[PDB]
Structures are given as C-alpha cells and as structure tokens.
Amino acid sequence: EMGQGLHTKMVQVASKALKIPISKIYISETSTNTVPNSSPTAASVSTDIYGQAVYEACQTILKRLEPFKKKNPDGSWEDWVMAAYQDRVSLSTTGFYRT
Amino acid sequence: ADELVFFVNGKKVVEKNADPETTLLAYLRRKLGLRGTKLGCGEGGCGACTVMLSKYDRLQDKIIHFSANACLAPICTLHHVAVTTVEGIGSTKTRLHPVQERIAKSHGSQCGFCTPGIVMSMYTLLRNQPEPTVEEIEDAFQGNLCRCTGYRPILQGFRTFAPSLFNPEEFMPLDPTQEPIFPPELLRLKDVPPKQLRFEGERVTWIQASTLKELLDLKAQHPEAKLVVGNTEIGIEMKFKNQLFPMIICPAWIPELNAVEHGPEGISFGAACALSSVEKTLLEAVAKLPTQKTEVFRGVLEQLRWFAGKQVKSVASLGGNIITASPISDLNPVFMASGTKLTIVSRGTRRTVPMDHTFFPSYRKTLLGPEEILLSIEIPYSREDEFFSAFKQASRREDDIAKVTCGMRVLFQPGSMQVKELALCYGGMADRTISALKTTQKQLSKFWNEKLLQDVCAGLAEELSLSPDAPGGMIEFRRTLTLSFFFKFYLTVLKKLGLDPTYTSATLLFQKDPPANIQLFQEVPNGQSKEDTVGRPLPHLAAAMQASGEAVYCDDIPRYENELFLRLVTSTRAHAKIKSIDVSEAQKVPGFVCFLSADDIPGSNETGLFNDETVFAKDTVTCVGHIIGAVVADTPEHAERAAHVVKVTYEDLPAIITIEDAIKNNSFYGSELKIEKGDLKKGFSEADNVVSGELYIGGQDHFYLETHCTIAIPKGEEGEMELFVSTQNAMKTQSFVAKMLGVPVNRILVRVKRMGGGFGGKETRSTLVSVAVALAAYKTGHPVRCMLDRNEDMLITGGRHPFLARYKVGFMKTGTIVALEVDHYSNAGNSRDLSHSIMERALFHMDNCYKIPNIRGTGRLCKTNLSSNTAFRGFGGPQALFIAENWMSEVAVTCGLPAEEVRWKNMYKEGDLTHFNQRLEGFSVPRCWDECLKSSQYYARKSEVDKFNKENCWKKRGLCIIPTKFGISFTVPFLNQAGALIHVYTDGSVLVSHGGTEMGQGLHTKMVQVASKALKIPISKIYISETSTNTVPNSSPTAASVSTDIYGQAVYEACQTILKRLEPFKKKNPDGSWEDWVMAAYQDRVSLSTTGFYRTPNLGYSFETNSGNAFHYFTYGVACSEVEIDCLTGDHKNLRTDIVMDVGSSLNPAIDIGQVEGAFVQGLGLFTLEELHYSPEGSLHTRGPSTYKIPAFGSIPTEFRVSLLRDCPNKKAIYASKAVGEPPLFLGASVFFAIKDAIRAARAQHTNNNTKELFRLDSPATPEKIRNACVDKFTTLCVTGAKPWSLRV
Amino acid sequence: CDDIPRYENELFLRLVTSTRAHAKIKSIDVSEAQKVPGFVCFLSADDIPG
C-alpha cells in the first residue's frame, strides 16, 4: 500500500467473495514470510492480480466451510468457522493468479 | 564519585556513575548489550549467570581466574577486574571455542538457556587446569543447573578434555596459547598504589577501603555502614529480604583481610579470604601434614565439598559466612566445636577469642560490636588424642540448605579412651548454632563405650527439642539426624582410636564412583543418502548458537527507547476480600508510570481456559499469588520497588488449601470421572488376598531455566499489537490477549522464536503474564515487557498436580491381579485450566502395562485456594502410573514373590484391550523388558544386592525394574490437527513454518530433517525461523508429545505439494539442479508457496460408553535402576540405571536419547528430590533453587545406559517414528521403587521381622522420608526420649 | 517507517556520496569524521561480506 488503496480494495473483494462484512476482515501489512517471490507493486495491475489471488483463496475457504454450512443452514459465519475448526478442517490457504 | 574502571572481554569499561546496587548481570545485559549471560534465579543457584573474572593478585603476584555469579556480583567490587562472558571466548560468527563446540556436538544443549553458564564454568576450569581430571570436571558444575538434558551428554562431552551419538575425533584440541590475553592495561595498573574509592548511587553509597586503617576509621565514623565482600548474602537480603543499606564498605582489597599465615597453633586466614582459597590451602595442609594434626581441617573440607558451587565459593568470604550467623551455617558448628580463634578489631581495640556457644546470642547475631570487624580466623591443628567429625544432611547433596549440620570434637586423656573434652555443635536445631553443653558436660571423665553412646543419644534426644512449629519443619527427621550424626561420630572415633565389618561403612565419608555411560541405537540403512538425515544423530540446529550465547530468548530482544517495565502485584492472602488499594507510596518511587487494575481493562476481565479466572483480581483474591494488578515504571528495579509498596487491605475468608480440606468440604470442579470394566464384586470374591491403602504424590515446579516472559508492542492502529512471548500456545495467547482488549483476533500477532524450557508450564499459564503486559501496552501506548523472577514464577504459574489415591486391589497367591479400585484426587488450584484432561489421562494410565479384568477408577478435581495447577510433562500420567506401581509392589511383597515375576505375569500381551477397551497393537514392552533384563544383568546384580545388604548394617541397596506405556494423542480430539506453511524463494532456499514451537526438544531440527528428506535436498537449504500466528493460524499448543508426529505430517504434505509443482520442470531439465527447477518454476509463474495440514484419524473416546480410540498408539519403555541408601542420613546414590525405549524408527537418535534422559531425570526429581512446602495458611515457602531442589549434575545415575529398541517401525507416525517427549518421564520411578526396596532391607534389619510388612512410602522419597522409614533405635528414641499415669491392660 | 520506535541501541546511517559526475576515487580520509561526537564507523565497499 502506497496510498492507492490496494488493501481497501482487497478487503472489499474478500468481503464480497466470502459474503461477510468488511468489518470482519483485516489486512495488516505485506511481508516476505507470508507471500514469497512477489512482483513489485506496479504496472497498475495489483488490484487485478492480487484481486484474483485473494478471490481464489476465498473460494477455497467457502468450499471447506460448505459442509458445515449445509448441516447448519441458519447458523452464523462464526458458527460455521468454529464447527470447521473443531472438525479439524484447516482455515488457512493460499490464493494464486497467473494472467 | 570516583570512576569505576574494569574490562569486559578485553574491552575497557569506564563507568562514571556506577550505582552500588548495580549487579554485573544487569550491567552486561542492559548497559553493554551482552545478553549471552542469563538470569535464571538471581540467588546463586542455577549458575545461568556464570562468568569468569580475572585479576592480578597483589599478594600472590600472579593473575588468577575464577568463576562467579553475575547476578550477585556488584560491579562496584570489580574495579580493575577483567570479566569474560560467553561472547568473549567464541561464537558462530567467528569460531567456537573448544568448550562451546563440544557441548553442542555432544548434544549437551537442548533449550540452551543454561549452556552459556555451563560453558563458562568449564571454560574457567580449563583456564586454571588445561588438562583436568574427570573429578575436577564433575566438580566444576556444583553450581550449574539444567532442566533439559539429564546432564549425561554434558559430562560425557566434557570428559574428552581430561553407532555413536558423536565423535570426539572431530573435536578441536584446546590450545591455551590462543586464549585471550589479560588486559595489558590492567597489568600496568598493578604497579600503582591502591586508593580508596567512592561510588554514589540512587540509594546507596559504596566505599572501597584500601587499607585496614581506612576500614577501621570508616567503621568508627560510620557504625551503621554495612560491610560487603562477596555479597552472596547481602545481595539476597536486598533483593529478597527487602533490606536497604544506605552505606556500604567493601574491604576486599585490604592485605590483612586476605593474608594466610601458618602458625604453630594452626592456620590463619584473613576474613576476606574466599572459601575456595581456604579450601585450597586446607587441602594442601592435609596432604603435607600428619593426619593426626589435620582432624579439624578435614572437618572444614568435608563441609566445603557440599557448600554451594565454584561460583559462590570463589567470592564468598570466610568472615562473611561466620558473621551472617545463619542457624544452618555449615561452618560455624565446626568453628565452634573446634574453638576456632577469631581476631576481632576496631579502631584501637583488638582481641583474639575462641568461638564458643556464646558467640551467637540470638538469631543471626554475633558478639561483634557495631564498630568492630572480623579481621582473621585461625583454624587449629588437631592435637594427639583429639578427633573431629563434621556432617551435613539436606534434601540434595549439591548446593543445598542443611536440615541438620554439625561439628564434633573429642579430646581424651593421653593415650586413653577417657573423655577430657567433648563438643557437639549443631546447626539447624535452633535459631542459631548451638552446643549440646548439658549432654556433653555429663560425659566428661567418662569412657568411650556403649553406655556413653546410649547416654549421649538420650541426652541429645532431650536437650535438642523442637516445637511442632519449628521453622524448617521436619521435626522427626532433624532430631533423628542429631542422634545418627553422633552415632556416626561415636563409631568413627572408635575406629580412629584403634569394629564390626557390618558397621564399618557407617564411618566412611561420601566417595563418588567412576561414571559409565553407554547409548545404543540403530544405524540407518546402508544405502541411505548422506543428505537424508532422517534416522541420524544430527545435533540440535541451534546448539552452536546456544553454546555461544547468540541464540535469542525473549528478554534478549533489545528494548525500544520508550519500552516500559511491568511488575505484577499479587495477593498475600489465600482467600480474602480486597477492601482497598493504596498506591500513594508507589507513586513516589522514581520512574513510576502507573498502577493497573481490573477497571483498566477495555475488553473483558474474564479469562482462563474455562473462563473461570480474572485477568486482574476483582474484589476477591483466591490464592497467594493471585494477580491483583500491575505497576509500570521506567526500569525493572523501579517497577519492583513501587509494586512492593502497594498497600492492599484484605478481609480474610474461610480457605480450602489441601485435598483433605476439599473432600471434607465437597469442594470440587465438575463431577466425578470414572472408567469401570468387568465385575468388581465377582472380582474381589475370587481374590485370595486384598490390600487397601492410601498413597500421596507431591507436586512439581517446572523450573524451566527461562522463566515466563512477554514483550507486547502496541502499534497504535486498529488495536493491533505484536507480542514476543515465551509460550507453547501462541494460539491461546493471541485469543486471550484479544478477548482482554476486546478486539478481533486478526488484530493480534504472537511470535515465538524459542523457549528456555516449557515442559507444559508454558502451555496456558504463560497468558497470566502476556495478557497483563498487553494491557499495560494498550494503556500506555508504549511497548512493555516483563520477565518473571524465579520466586514470582514458582508462586504464580502453577505446577504439576499433587495426587492423593485410595486404592483396593484383589489378587491371587500367584500374584495375578483380579480386581482393582482406585479413587484419584488432584489438587487443581483456583481455576480449572487443564485439570480435567489431566485427570482423564491419569485414568487412562491407572493400568500401566498390566491387564486387570475387573477395574474401577475415579477422579475428582479439588477446588482450592492455591495457584491453579496445570500441565507438566506427563500430564497426569506419571501420578496414575506411580499409584499403579505402588500397589503392584505391595502385591509382590504380600505374595512373597519376586517383583519382576509378578509384573511380568500380569503384563498385557499383543492384541489385549486396556481398561478403556483399546486394542494394544505393536505392544513392545515384552521386548524392552527382556532386553533390559539382559543388558542390565538384573538377576546377577539381584544376588549382589542381597549380599551387600548382608555385609552392611547401616547402608542398603535396592534394585527395581518397571515398565511403562503412554498413550499418544491429545485426549481432546480436535487438538489433534497441525498446519505448516512452506515458501521456496527464487534462490532455491526454503523457509519452513509450522504450528509447533521450539522449547529445547528439537522440534524444528526434526522438521528440517523431514523437509530435507521429503524434498530430497540438503538441510543446509532449509530454515525454520520462528512460530507466528500470521503464518500458521489456529494451532494447538505444542504438547502431548505429538508435535513431531503432526507437524511432521503437515510439513511432509506441503513438501509433496512443492514437488508436484516442480515436477514438470524436473522432466524438462532432468540434469538440472534444484535451483534451476525452482527458477524455471518461478519464470513460468508457478506458485512456490503452500500450506500443509494433518488430522490424526480415528480418534474419539467416550468415558460414558467406554468406547472409541483414545490414542493413535502407545510409546513403551522399561527402566531398571539400582540405588544405595544411607540408613542413618536419608542420603542415597543412584548407582546405575538401564533404559530400553521404544520410539519406533527414531527420526533422530541423538535428540530422542536426549529426551529419554531428560524426561527420566525429571521423573527422578519428581519421585526423589523435588518438594514444595506450603505454610498451613497456603503460602509457598520454597520459591527458589535454594529451597526447591531439582536434579543436579551429581544426581544422575553414575552408570547411565540408554537403548532405543531396534527394528520396531511405527506405521502410525511420520517415517515410522514415535512420540518421545513425555513417555520416559515415569521410568524415573524405577529409582523410587529401588529405594523402597532398599528401605525394606533396612526395616528387616532394625525394624521388625515381618517379611510381608507393607509400610507406606509417599512421593517424593526425599532424605526425610527415607530416613524416617528406616526405623531403628535412634528414630524410636527420638519419640520416647522427647509416661501416662495409667494404661488400660 | 520512521514512525516506528527506535530501539534503545539503534544507530543512524548517513550516506556518503560523490560530488563528481565521473572520477577515480584516489583516497578517503575519515580522520575529521572520527572526531565527531557519537561517531561509530565509516562503511565502504571493503566492509561488504557478500
């Protein structure tokens, strides 16, 4: 982030993809031990490419939470997350995009 | 004020504002940035702060090198002294010194927190003796503690200075010519005349007197001035006794206080002479002078053998111990009984008077006047017909407080056996050193015979009485020692005047035996690649840095310019209402920032695993140590002082301390837990015999060398906070900090590099400190940190759960078990925490390795006003296994059959189900059992033990072999999950991250070994930096010994994902390198980052239906130990231990053997040495290494053998390996039952003739319980000699 | 970045740059620099480990 609002847009994207308020999503910083071999933030394509990476990662999360969402249709996001955790389903994943 | 000028690792230091209260440790760490030296206890016991000091000795005209505790050395005593820390002898950036290299390659370092201190003790020895003997090497560590290793690797690696796990042939030879030179500047400053210096601090003025005249003037001029030489006593007074001496005078330089004169009556030492000098001078006198002239000298030396360690003896002055006049001083009894001459001087006056009973008028006082100072002490040569003895007994031989210590002298008429003079002086029997004058007076003119013996014992039994509330407790034991000591003295004088062969050994002084260490493990397949380290003894990856002091532990992290310090304010009551708090005086301490309490919490004050705790006490305190608030200040000292003056007004409430109080008051957490199988009724009905009883096993303080510590960095944005914590649970630390702050979890980042030991003590209780530091960071906006002092840690953080059991077992004459009933009660403390799961694992192991057809076990958690107890290596398993082995032992005795026979016939067999209905597959105990029997030569030694017992009346040997099985897996199903994150950078280097933390067990080392094997690349290309919540989330705490199992799998899967992605490029360029395939993958836009995850399958046990798998598999092992107890003192030797452990196909035999030995030693400590004492009101007495005794270098089995079972691959875990962390700890019980075996031999000797008697022996089997159990004419006399008008016939 | 608190032992670096567009470096004299209060060291190409 250098002022162009890339993180804001990424949160907006995560929120829409996961279908939850932006208030439940956070982006703290950029670091090489969380996402390696990154291209420099340039060429105006950041939103484009990271938007997809974040989107894909969100998709994986939705597929993992799907079973619990089905067993408890009227439950909350928190309910599905805790149930997934207790069922020992990983709540961490990478997202990647290739133009 | 004068300038303080000394040197540190060759570098000159000029301190212009030296504060008398500053210790070298604080200076090195906070001023010089040399953090290799650590704080482990602050009271001279752990040795973690050990450094070497060098100086030119004017009187000797030579440079001398000696160790010392940085934690107790005032920098103001170091003017013109050269300090050498671990950073000054070598490092991984330059080159490791041989000492650092050997301890690391020998696997002598695990968590590594103790490595620097141990390295410096060894180094200091080498600087004094380049080629020391095994004995000198062993004695170099009397003052160093290690909780991880079991000490064996350290000693074995260091003895080299005098398949396999390491190869001494690779070790670089020691070369003195290449050691750092003594600062050339200092050598010049020796020609300069010494001058009186003055240092001014915040609250203290220090005067370094250069001459005796100066000292006497100063004493006259300032009577209240406190003298200080070694400060090993005063530092404790100021640090722990809340004392403050405005003015201090150090006379250490004065020639007279350091002179050694050999006169006609004896040898004179100046009062400032260090005990190490007295010890060296006396050893010399004993070697050159006739034995008849050195009776007292040898008395002094015997006490000095077990007097602290090298660090303390090198600075502790002779006069200092004398004047401190502690009731348990080991030297004063000897000086008194011998009439050692004291030369006391003041300006003008002077006198030399023999020390007698009147020299100590009251508690810690002497006959010295305020203006007087002890100038010198002359220890007398012994005369003809004069014999002397000095004895001491404590909880542990090494560096410990005497329960009873003494000096005994007897002078007969020329060439006769007729007493002319008799002096029996004791320490530990009054509030001062006393002489049993009434008793000995009656023996003058009497003759040395049986009658005198009976008379004296009766006299002592009556004159040296102890009220039931005597400080130090252990009334019976102490009184028994006073008589046993005289008995030893009586026999020794008889021998000297010249004795039944079976009485001889009772006159022998402790003699250490030659050590023997053998480790056996399996070599890896002959065709295994040199780069595949799985199965090889690869040293811990951070061992070299741990040995050099470069390894960074939480507090080693530098402080921000604006970082503040937190000091917890805790309850001094076990249960009371908080009527009010007054911080008015705290606010007066310089640097005071603020006082934080519950009302400052923005989020929730409700914390704890089961939300049954407060972050900060609200209106009520429920245990001594209950955190009420916290003070934040600019420095640690300022925060400590302010906190200390915070006034809390309480209103006591009925308290429930003990498990007994709990049962009677029905004070429990939750309902009863139970496992029941078979038909008890029908079981006991078929039983030939039935034994019922009660058994107790004490608690345990983790004593990780690195105490709890947390650094919290408040970012100032969106409630974000970054914390560096010494914890095994980054996940709970994160969630608890967030819950307290009232912000989403995604705002908190917890980072864990390494822990200087965890052992379960940092699985949950680390949050007590973390959440509080976080609050301080939140409130101040400043970064804040807090590392607990040992006394705080021991008092607040909880420990192992004390257990009480009530059992009933039914069995046949054959020894076969047919029925068992056991009710377990644990003392959980003031909150649930992990108590419930601990009780569950307890119940899961009440069977150990024996099939019991009809069984019923129950458990209850006692809700008490004691710090909440938590996980501790074993997690309830050890207590339940100990209870099981206790009744098994009684069954053997009752049936009159060999214990090994009874155990074997009751033992499970392949395919059998446990009491909780889980099939035992791959049950290897029989294999470990048979190999251990054979390799240990059990039967042969069995007969030799009996023989020894027949030839010895006051010493007995015991031998016992016991098995163990430990279920592997968190008994809470959802905790059996693990995640990993792997990044391959474009240079091909790999960065592995996983949910597990490093606490010395080598989890990272093994994960790199695994990654290397999975990826098929050298370990050099892989690295693991730390554990963080933003790389691997929702991680389970690093515990239950399954970290290798589960993270190994997560790491393995992530690696498999990497390989699948690189495959296309591997096929396109077959002759290419890993670097080529990585770069090509990058160029082709293929992600080189992936997560890995594992979920332990088929787990889910129900206590309700007694069904479902509780564990993934079991780790087995067998241990055979032999001991020798001293029936007269309670002391004992761990002669030999043989262990055979099944860890499947070890991933790393070096680390796995290290874990076996480390756990074994920790169990040994639990069952034989470690004991926490609490006042009746619930206030812990034992808050330091001085009173709490964990195994020392000299506590390990002299002959220690460990073998890893061969050809036993475990298809249930990563690369056919098995968990090893906790499973071996219980095997330490083998030492316990060997001791009980020895005690039964003693009882059959002097107690009674009932070969089938069943006396109760609770854990720990300390010297007290051992001695008290050895009932004889002396123990008996201590009761009868302490009746009723009538007595029913 | 600079708003991040400095560690108590954190030092400061100041680049030393060329006042010429193209020239040979004949010599570098830090004798006067070494005299400045708080001076720690002068780093140059020869100090690079890699």
Ligand SMILES: Cc1cc2nc3c(=O)[nH]c(=O)nc-3n(C[C@H](O)[C@H](O)[C@H](O)COP(=O)(O)OP(=O)(O)OC[C@H]3O[C@@H](n4cnc5c(N)ncnc54)[C@H](O)[C@@H]3O)c2cc1C
């Ligand atoms: C880890 C550890 C283990 C220990 N082990 C043992 C043990 O096994 N047995 C035992 O008995 N003790 C033991 N001690 C106690 C202690 O080390 C001794 O009492 C020591 O000899 C005191 O010497 P010092 O020079 O360090 O005293 P300081 O702390 O410098 O002074 C002690 C007291 O002596 C006074 N004093 C000192 N010199 C003179 C003088 N010339 N004239 C008048 N007053 C003087 C001081 O004013 C002060 O009151 C241990 C201490 C530690 C920290």
Ligand SMILES: NC(=O)C1=CN([C@@H]2O[C@H](COP(=O)(O)OP(=O)(O)OC[C@H]3O[C@@H](n4cnc5c(N)ncnc54)[C@H](O)[C@@H]3O)[C@@H](O)[C@H]2O)C=CC1
């Ligand atoms: N730190 C260490 O590792 C060691 C320290 N020491 C010495 O131990 C000293 C301990 O000092 P403290 O903790 O203040 O304890 P202390 O100096 O008050 O001594 C306590 C002991 O004195 C005896 N005692 C005292 N009052 C008594 C009474 N009224 N009736 C019967 N017996 C009584 C008991 O044996 C009791 O255990 C230290 O100052 C040090 O000199 C000795 C060995 C090891």
Ligand SMILES: Nc1nc2c(c(=O)[nH]1)N[C@H]1C(S)=C(S)[C@@H](COP(=O)(O)O)O[C@H]1N2
């Ligand atoms: N050196 C060292 N070894 C240690 C510990 C420790 O804190 N330090 N913890 C023990 C405990 S209580 C456990 S549960 C296991 C945890 O690590 P693991 O699962 O990787 O074996 O290591 C054991 N070995």
Ligand SMILES: O=C(O)c1ccccc1O
């Ligand atoms: O050993 C366990 O079964 C266990 C269960 C829950 C939490 C920590 C643990 O060690």
Ligand code: MOS
């Ligand atoms: O592609 Mo923007 O950094 S010139």
Ligand code: MOS
């Ligand atoms: O399961 Mo280990 O932390 S008692």
Ligand code: FES
């Ligand atoms: S910190 Fe100095 S002896 Fe333990």
Ligand code: FES
């Ligand atoms: S390696 Fe010694 S305490 Fe950990």
Ligand SMILES: [Ca+2]
């Ligand atoms: Ca508890």
